[PDB]
Amino acid sequence: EQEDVLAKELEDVNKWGLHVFRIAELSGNRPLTVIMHTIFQERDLLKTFKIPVDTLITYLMTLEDHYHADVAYHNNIHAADVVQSTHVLLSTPALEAVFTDLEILAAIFASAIHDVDHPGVSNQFLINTNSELALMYNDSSVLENHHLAVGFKLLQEENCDIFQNLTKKQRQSLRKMVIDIVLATDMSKHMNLLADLKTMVETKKVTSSGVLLLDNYSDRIQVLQNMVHCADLSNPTKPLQLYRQWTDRIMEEFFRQGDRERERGMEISPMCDKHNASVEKSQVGFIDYIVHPLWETWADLVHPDAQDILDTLEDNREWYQSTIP
Amino acid sequence: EDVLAKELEDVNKWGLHVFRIAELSGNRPLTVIMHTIFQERDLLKTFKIPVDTLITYLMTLEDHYHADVAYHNNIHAADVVQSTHVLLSTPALEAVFTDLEILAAIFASAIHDVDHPGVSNQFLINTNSELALMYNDSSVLENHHLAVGFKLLQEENCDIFQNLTKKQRQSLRKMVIDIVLATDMSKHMNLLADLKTMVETKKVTSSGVLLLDNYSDRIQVLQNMVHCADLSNPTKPLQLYRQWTDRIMEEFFRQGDRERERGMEISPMCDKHNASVEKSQVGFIDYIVHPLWETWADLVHPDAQDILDTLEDNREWYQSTIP
Numbered sequence A: 001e002q003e004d005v006l007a008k009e010l011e012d013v014n015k016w017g018l019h020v021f022r023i024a025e026l027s028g029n030r031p032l033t034v035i036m037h038t039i040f041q042e043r044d045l046l047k048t049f050k051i052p053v054d055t056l057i058t059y060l061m062t063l064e065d066h067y068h069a070d071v072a073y074h075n076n077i078h079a080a081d082v083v084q085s086t087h088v089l090l091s092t093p094a095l096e097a098v099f100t101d102l103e104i105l106a107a108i109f110a111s112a113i114h115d116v117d118h119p120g121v122s123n124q125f126l127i128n129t130n131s132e133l134a135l136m137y138n139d140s141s142v143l144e145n146h147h148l149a150v151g152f153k154l155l156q157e158e159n160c161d162i163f164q165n166l167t168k169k170q171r172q173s174l175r176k177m178v179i180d181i182v183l184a185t186d187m188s189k190h191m192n193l194l195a196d197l198k199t200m201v202e203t204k205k206v207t208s209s210g211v212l213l214l215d216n217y218s219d220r221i222q223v224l225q226n227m228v229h230c231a232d233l234s235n236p237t238k239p240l241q242l243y244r245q246w247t248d249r250i251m252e253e254f255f256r257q258g259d260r261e262r263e264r265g266m267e268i269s270p271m272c273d274k275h276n277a278s279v280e281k282s283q284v285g286f287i288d289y290i291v292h293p294l295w296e297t298w299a300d301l302v303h304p305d306a307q308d309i310l311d312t313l314e315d316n317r318e319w320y321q322s323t324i325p
Numbered sequence B: 001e002d003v004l005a006k007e008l009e010d011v012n013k014w015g016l017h018v019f020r021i022a023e024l025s026g027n028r029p030l031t032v033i034m035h036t037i038f039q040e041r042d043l044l045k046t047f048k049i050p051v052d053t054l055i056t057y058l059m060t061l062e063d064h065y066h067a068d069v070a071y072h073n074n075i076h077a078a079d080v081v082q083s084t085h086v087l088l089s090t091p092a093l094e095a096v097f098t099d100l101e102i103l104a105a106i107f108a109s110a111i112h113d114v115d116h117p118g119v120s121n122q123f124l125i126n127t128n129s130e131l132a133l134m135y136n137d138s139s140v141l142e143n144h145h146l147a148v149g150f151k152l153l154q155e156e157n158c159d160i161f162q163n164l165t166k167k168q169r170q171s172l173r174k175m176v177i178d179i180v181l182a183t184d185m186s187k188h189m190n191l192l193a194d195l196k197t198m199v200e201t202k203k204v205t206s207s208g209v210l211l212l213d214n215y216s217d218r219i220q221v222l223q224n225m226v227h228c229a230d231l232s233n234p235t236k237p238l239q240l241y242r243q244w245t246d247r248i249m250e251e252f253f254r255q256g257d258r259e260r261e262r263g264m265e266i267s268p269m270c271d272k273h274n275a276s277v278e279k280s281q282v283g284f285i286d287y288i289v290h291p292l293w294e295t296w297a298d299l300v301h302p303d304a305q306d307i308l309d310t311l312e313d314n315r316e317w318y319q320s321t322i323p
């Protein structure tokens, strides 16, 4: 049965390298719904937060429908992958018993919504084309503000309020944390976020049990922001057969954007010109300047928990580099 | 219309009779004052703005201020525009700001509260309003004022920036966004701290004229300038100030009536059954308005002395009405 194979694959939800594309096919293009449901059951979140199962499924299906099935990368498979990757990172030994159930819920929910309704073009493209989204959001974290607004507005649809049984203080705290986490996925914030994560590593405090000591909102939210940003930038850290599929998809999405820019007489964005592209050099640069600086720092924060992930990233960088000469 | 022209001769003076202008212009103070200031600064010729486009945009903008909101309406907008216009001419700021920067501060002032509903950001957040959902609880009103002010340029014959280059338009847009977002009072303390740092390190010519080399410093001055203009009511002649106080208290009390009817906790200064209007003005001057204007006066010393003098006289008067 197709459902038996799906269930088998979902037994890997605690593992880096889950067969997320296979789950997308086996679930009938519902990877985000089935992975979120499995994660909520694995973490006992429905019981903890009194979430009716039918409300959870109804919301997840509606949220998943608001990802664009015609966008090659920023679709429901990406959202499911970022959810599952955040779920693995939350389980790292260095964070055991660090975060509350509400903080865990915020990080997972933020991951699920963090790209919803993405049109497959960048913030800079939306700004430069005078788009309605950029007009609404004053050119500032245009997509990320939109993803938050859609993700929260869908909670108001019929039988979609998965937070119906949280206290008012819980809903207020969860909303603020989710906003802070999704806004941190704007790449224009990456350098300052990484700089701050490095300062935390250099000053980090560990408890008598060996777990990170985070004793104020600023430190707790910074870790959760960088956790979801690492999940969002995790593709080059995955087994190569998954990483190559993510690269094929982001290139397709970029090339389609660059076709729009070329037609409009605009300068083509970096990496978006299918007639002057070096996919492999672009991956090596992405890893060297963005992905490895981030993941090496996260690995230092939770050291040695993420050593195998870092090792895979480094192997994948070597593999892409080897395809150049 | 001849009396209206006589009043507009004071457009370069602190204490313009803005309420008289509102009445004499048929409730078009924002349009007539903006047009006057644009003519006075030669901005139409400088930026090739067709006069019909300017007037059409101004009237559309002014129509999107609510006539039933007692304070945050077109008269307040016109007042902030004209106040910014005066502050831009401070002698100590001579040679600081380009024409594009001047255009940006004046346009920002004109749009800075457009479509204001007469309730605060906190109210909009606590009522789970559509605006707060759109803007993720962050500078909710101010993001909305910007979005409306810019969207209206797309109406028929409304694009007053049509003859700017794409680069000029992009620079103006960024400066206007940075200025209007700085009018959110949640940013007041950080803005004031940065203005103080700028005072402590200020460089001037031998004539006492401010030298601001970097864009970060210049936009901070323009942010503080429009913020001072937005907070200028207690620095105006007392007859004007008392009308502004009556208006903000009416708007606050109406917010409090909505909060009471909803069963919400009533916001500070918003409970008409437990208010002390005069004590609130003295506290607002002592903790917000005078620290800000004293710092501005230091930046432009001694050019703001008469404004600061009025504020101090008005504080003493309001204090004297407390038994």
Ligand SMILES: COc1cc2c(cc1OC)CN(C=O)CC2
Binding pocket: A187, A235, A236, A246, A247, A250, A271, A282, A283, A286
């Ligand atoms: C150069 O390769 C990549 C670049 C980027 C992404 C993924 C990539 O490869 C898998 C993800 N992003 C989404 O906007 C940021 C840019």
Ligand SMILES: COc1cc2c(cc1OC)CN(C=O)CC2
Binding pocket: B185, B233, B234, B244, B245, B248, B269, B280, B281, B284
């Ligand atoms: C206590 O008196 C005032 C308070 C406030 C304003 C004006 C006042 O008097 C004229 C203007 N504001 C609009 O949001 C901030 C609060």
Ligand SMILES: [Mg+2]
Binding pocket: A009
């Ligand atoms: Mg297997």
Ligand SMILES: [Mg+2]
Binding pocket: A064, A065, A066, A067, A068, A069
């Ligand atoms: Mg869809």
Ligand SMILES: [Mg+2]
Binding pocket: A114, A115, A143, A185, A186
């Ligand atoms: Mg994103």
Ligand SMILES: [Mg+2]
Binding pocket: B112, B113, B141, B183, B184
């Ligand atoms: Mg305002």
Ligand SMILES: [Zn+2]
Binding pocket: A078, A082, A114, A115, A185, A232
């Ligand atoms: Zn993403």
Ligand SMILES: [Zn+2]
Binding pocket: B076, B080, B112, B113, B183, B230
């Ligand atoms: Zn205002």
